[PDB]
Design a binder for this molecule. Structure first.
Ligand SMILES: CC(=O)N[C@@H]1[C@@H](O)[C@H](O)[C@@H](CO)O[C@H]1O
Ligand SMILES: CC(=O)N[C@@H]1[C@@H](O)[C@H](O)[C@@H](CO)O[C@H]1O
Ligand SMILES: CC(=O)N[C@@H]1[C@@H](O)[C@H](O)[C@@H](CO)O[C@H]1O
Lengths: 323, 160, 323, 160, 323, 160
């Protein structure tokens, strides 16, 4: 009669590494590294992301004619740009503090696009039909949907002064532009006043813009330039535009609602009717593991990104079938 | 192994064992067989389960983390942001990989230790009522029943 | 005759966590996490902090009439602002590079407030009694203690030019302002010249300021605006102010002395006659432990902040009283 | 226990001991009494004291660390600063908690080991002049003095 | 007949620390901390670094007369400045976005200095011999080698406009200056036009400069000031300079080639004909060890810098000769 | 030591054994001398070699890292950069020093364990053919040659 003391063994082929030995076959183990996802863009807790498609933040907010499909979208869980998001500004120029504007939008959960200055009744003494081949739609010269190009009327460009009181109970993002003719002749024909200027002020914003005329290389067939600016009008505050030329006035503005967990990501993956708690540019993740080696960019609640190819923790013991 | 049991004086494991990690084999005439020690195996499961849950718990969830853009005149800021992201990534990758490697070592020694202790627990009971032969095995000098082989498993059997 | 080998045990109920088991009662253990603090703001190695109270860095440095009690303070170990530090700028406007100015004061251990441009003798051909209801004191229109509002004198504002050579043997912080009338009439009335300018230069500073006149929303009942600027005048260097209007001249400047370990904190705790080597916004700490979970903001020599609720190291052994 | 001694073949501790962590008890005619083994208790103290001081020392002093302000057009910088502070805090909290958890295990096993080795040092001393009874205890065959019980506690003891 | 089981021992005096015990003598160990270096500046993978010596980046790029020996250097593995690199800008003023330019040069592996605006045929109607004592060479008044001081010719300074089309197939770094006279008197006899301006534009760059005249403390014996600017001209794009005064025109420009692994370091070590894979400001390192406590600044593929004075892993066992 | 062999029941080491870390000294009326246990020594060498290589490999090369410049109005950005560099430096210094201290302890125990198991290996072979004397040593009962001493070394010697 004999009684022996021994340990469990099996067919398991799992391997793990230790400090003293690599690839040690064990009986039971647990993976802590998530490496799977569905190469799809999903809703984040039921809320769909804003897909800018061929447009970028600039195109979307200024109302580039090629981004009309975005006009009605009022809320999203995250923002998505693609490698092919070229349609930004259509009229050449500089978008001042553009990166900071993007950062601002990354914490916006939703907004209401509204007419801050109705086209029909805001500029009684100025022409508002200004258009450009640089911003064409349906093969016809057009303009930004949220801005209005003001020009002289009947050989005159009166000094304008319009105001808007923020009674939306929320921060209102106001955008506008300043046009810069390539020569004085154009400055004269468009705005009449040779030494024009634009002024924009609120309780905490104060800037003056002077046209800077000069011949410039053509971009999108334009020697002219248009610089874009923006500011956040506090609830209850008033913004005043005053000018005698060169102002590309605001028509539509945005009452913003703040949220958490949003952000902008770049992806070439497609949107599908799936839901997730964790989204990456490559696809969505559904996991409880502590780490993942899929992508460093994450939206939601995700495992920690790490460069590891493998992270397997041994639970059972050294497997020795002894066959 | 650190304690000499697993892959030690006890050369291999038992594919016949399918109740736990540590156990025994019957060699009397009423037939042979395997029997896992619930006490040991379970305690080992409590520990290992706690270990894994600690590793997982320490790594709280990563919330929204996305890239940032910088204008052409913000190259230093862009590189700083880059140094920060790469820096943190290096540490966490290092931490995760080191922790798993070191704990895997510890886990394997833990089992080696449990086999050793269970072996000594038995070897201290039988004492003179049997001898040690094939390492891990004891040949009963008095020869006993299946019910008796059980006395050994349940930690009873108090004979000189 | 029997000799036994055993181990210590006691009535201790200390518990610590291990990798395999939580809440293990042990005989002896040491706490490594400091969780106790004074309340109370204390002296740091004998030196008292500067309590701005109802004022902020701006109100203090510009000399807002409601921060007078701070006028005499010359040295401090750290700066303390409160959630109620609202008294800063009193005349609406922008404080250029304000954040950087705060950072600068963060390494200042002391300074001397002196008259860079004495009220009587520096501006012979200009009025200096300019006062405002936006910067009132005792229910009467007043003005910043360290600045002077220069205005027209006898229907004339002569082009001024004043210099100051830094012979303090230290960096001199100089502050000044530029006033912006809401309309041309005011500009003419206060400064005579419609196209005025202000120039401030040193060996390494060079800036020009132009009035930007326009109607604006009233702030603190003012449509006008005042922008504030500053520079650090190096030892031995000269600063030159030149203007024909709109200059809110420096009257008092600060000779700065640099130190180490200081900083600015926000706290609602009270200052008491206690001394510490480690201060947080919630209270002082007196400890040798490596960690603390009291607050991430610290002044002096403190334990490392951690979010941990408990960090206890077992020294003794598993406690089995065997009762 | 990793080494089987504490909470092992020696079920519990002695609330009666107050001279150290490890020791003995004697059953002579001159009476009984507990006595700590200075040798092993002291080494254990020097080591654990070194462990705690090393842990403390590696965490040098935390000098002034304060928050910074950012204007309304410095949101990205403000968020970078935020990412930095949170990233470091995450790492230090993680390091501290892990270091403590891991060393505590190591410490408990340390003691277990010392008891096991102390037991063996005695067992190899007595040899045949005593038998192993209720685990941890030894019954002398020749019965021996207090001055002799000492020879046992001090590693001397002459006779097989 | 006896057989014993024992362990190795020797005369090794190697010591290591452990959690439980310090300075433990062991039979075998390995140093993981590199603390040895060349004490010299070496070639990095066969390529020598650019030694600016007594000059800094500004002096180098603008063509400060005192940096002529650098004019012919076209490629390098890294850039070295020294504690005595004082020769940068010789005419007092501000170098706009200087730090960023340094960052740009940090990823440049080589470039070709070429004449963007030949002195001979670029300015038919302006004088180009403008020189200054602030930028003297050989005890004689001179000027930057890469810029040209344009002044009035025959009592007249005609509005100028010049263009350059980038056909180098690489980014072209263009630098220029704007001169600011100390008084209108000087402004007029140098440029004729009391109210002058300078305009510089490309497809993505658009800036205008206005002279700001005012008495300023003398720096390098000059009350005048010269601000310096730069921009990167994309391949194929055009840069246009237009002005009626105050322009310190570009004469030489640089077609940039980008590379990886370069950087700017400050060292007082000397260049020798040695080669390394790792360079620090104190000297080159040739090691396979994971860590180094030599210096935090490193160029190449180096060990990780740590503050440790010692890092040694024991490989052998506790050494007990028992002699 | 954690396992009681090195500097334990085997007081010191042999400067006379130069073929390995663990071995045997023989005493025959044919002669005396030392002999290293290749099996053990090699396996310990593979383990320690992989350990050191793992520590080295986890610290992948540090590529170009240099200082940055900031104008006089970029003090906050300068301090941020300073915090980042100091923070990472503190973490790596800490990680490096801690990792070495902890692994050095584990390494010493590793050897101790190796000596213990090799001893228990021989003890279980010389079961009842000799007795345990000066700890680490065994005095044969039957007196055995040089070939037989080798049978003990190569793990054979199958005598009751
Ligand atoms: C030498 C070594 O241990 N590394 C190998 C690795 O190259 C291989 O890819 C992996 C899976 O096949 O198995 C490991 O054992
Ligand atoms: C320390 C803290 O949490 N801050 C609060 C502060 O917001 C509040 O205004 C004050 C009222 O006494 O009490 C403090 O405790
Ligand atoms: C360590 C110690 O206390 N010293 C005593 C020693 O004086 C005595 O001669 C010996 C034998 O009785 O036992 C030792 O324990």
């Amino acid at each position: 009669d004999t009684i022996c003391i021994g340990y469990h063994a099996n067919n398991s082929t799992d391997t793990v590494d230790t400090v003293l030995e690599k690839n040690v076959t064990v009986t039971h183990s647990v993976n802590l590294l998530e490496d799977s996802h569905n190469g799809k863009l999903c809703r984040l807790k039921g809320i769909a992301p804003l897909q800018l498609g061929k447009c970028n933040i600039a195109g979307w907010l200024l109302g580039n004619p090629e981004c009309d499909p975005l006009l009605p979208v009022r809320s999203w869980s995250y923002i998505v740009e693609t490698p092919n998001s070229e349609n930004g500004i259509c009229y050449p120029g500089d978008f001042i503090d553009y990166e900071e504007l993007r950062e601002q939008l990354s914490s916006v959960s939703s907004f209401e696009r509204f007419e801050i200055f109705p086209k029909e009744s805001s500029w009684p003494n100025h022409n508002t039909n200004g258009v450009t081949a640089a911003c064409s739609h349906e093969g016809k010269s057009s303009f930004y949907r949220n801005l209005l190009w003001l020009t002289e009327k009947e050989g005159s460009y009166p000094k304008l002064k319009n105001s808007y009181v923020n009674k939306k109970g929320k921060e209102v993002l106001v955008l506008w532009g300043i046009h810069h003719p390539p020569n004085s002749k154009e400055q004269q024909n468009l705005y009449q006043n040779e030494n024009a200027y634009v002024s924009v002020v609120t309780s905490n914003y104060n800037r003056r813009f002077t046209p800077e005329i000069a011949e410039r290389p053509k971009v999108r067939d334009q020697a002219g330039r248009m610089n874009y600016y923006w500011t956040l009008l506090k609830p209850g505050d008033t913004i005043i535009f005053e000018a005698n030329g060169n102002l590309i006035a605001p028509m539509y503005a945005f009452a913003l609602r703040r949220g958490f967990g949003s952000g902008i990501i770049t992806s070439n993956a497609s949107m599908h009717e799936c839901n997730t708690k964790c989204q990456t540019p490559l696809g969505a993740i559904n996991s409880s593991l502590p780490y993942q080696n899929i992508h460093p960019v994450t939206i939601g609640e995700c495992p920690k990104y790490v460069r590891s190819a493998k992270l397997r923790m041994v639970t059972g013991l050294r497997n020795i079938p002894a066959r | 192994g650190l304690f000499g049991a697993i892959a030690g004086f006890i050369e291999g494991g038992w594919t016949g064992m399918i109740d736990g990690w540590y156990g025994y084999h019957h060699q009397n005439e009423q037939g042979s067989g395997y029997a896992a020690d619930q006490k040991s195996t379970q305690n080992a499961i409590n520990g290992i389960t706690n270990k894994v849950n600690s590793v997982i718990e320490k790594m709280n969830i990563q919330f929204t983390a996305v890239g940032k853009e910088f204008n052409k005149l913000e190259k230093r800021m862009e590189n700083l942001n880059n140094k920060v992201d790469d820096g943190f990534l290096d540490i966490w990758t290092y931490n995760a990989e080191l922790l798993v490697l070191l704990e895997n070592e510890r886990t394997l020694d833990f089992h080696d230790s449990n086999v050793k202790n269970l072996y000594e627990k038995v070897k201290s009971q039988l004492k003179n009522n049997a001898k040690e032969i094939g390492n891990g095995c004891f040949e009963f000098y008095h020869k006993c029943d299946n019910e008796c082989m059980e006395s050994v498993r349940n930690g009873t059997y108090d004979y000189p």
